């Protein structure tokens, strides 16, 4: 029994902290503000059953932003391949990646 | 009499004055004769990191003025 007294009386007791895309002090954006905004605007009013399957690309992008599991997997694959290449001497890291060139300001 | 306590108080005064002076002098020595820059906030740290790159010698204390441009 979700007695939604907040929506009835118009009070805002806890809906201000339910999402990171809501208003935050000094307009400090969330790390995944864009993805959550897209997911919420996609899945607004169509119901939970439709939102699960229809706005699934947006939710997948949001999850990837939140956890970076696939990005970390790609980076780990790159690191492993680079280590394997270095072991066999098939690759030489560039000087800007070896701390030899001054990074741009 | 009571002034006989003064030598010990003076020794303790010297022992407590050493830390402060030492810290200030070490900060000046390791920051090019200037106060060690504080980085209470990320903006100050970003300024410090940019200054380090601008210096070219990987030290933030050395500052490049109008002579560096053009």
């Amino acid at each position: 029994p979700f007695f939604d007294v907040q929506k009835r009386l118009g009070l805002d007791l806890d809906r201000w902290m339910t999402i990171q895309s809501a208003e935050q002090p000094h307009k400090i954006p969330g790390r995944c503000h864009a993805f959550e905004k897209e997911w919420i605007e996609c899945a607004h009013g169509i119901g939970g059953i439709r939102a699960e399957k229809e706005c699934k690309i947006e939710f997948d992008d949001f999850v990837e932003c939140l956890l970076r599991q696939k990005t970390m997997k790609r980076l780990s694959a790159i690191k492993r391949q680079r280590d394997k290449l270095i072991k066999e001497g098939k690759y030489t890291p560039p000087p800007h990646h070896l701390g030899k060139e001054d990074p741009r300001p | 009499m009571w002034f006989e306590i003064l030598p010990g108080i003076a020794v303790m005064a010297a022992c407590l004055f050493i830390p402060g002076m030492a810290t200030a002098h070490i900060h000046k020595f390791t920051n090019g004769g200037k106060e060690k820059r504080v980085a209470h906030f990320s903006y100050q740290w970003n300024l410090m990191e940019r200054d380090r790159c601008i210096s070219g010698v990987n030290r933030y204390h050395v500052t490049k003025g109008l002579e560096n441009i053009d």
Binding site: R104, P105 | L47, M48, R50, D51, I54, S55, T63, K64, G65, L66, N68, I69
Partner: peptide, 22 residues
């Protein structure tokens, strides 16, 4: 998905403002 388009090294070269924060 797709390939992230990235500008080339040449087209992001500017005469840097090589002054200090102070």
């Amino acid at each position: 998905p797709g390939i992230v388009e990235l500008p080339t090294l040449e087209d992001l070269k500017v005469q840097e403002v090589k002054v200090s924060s102070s």
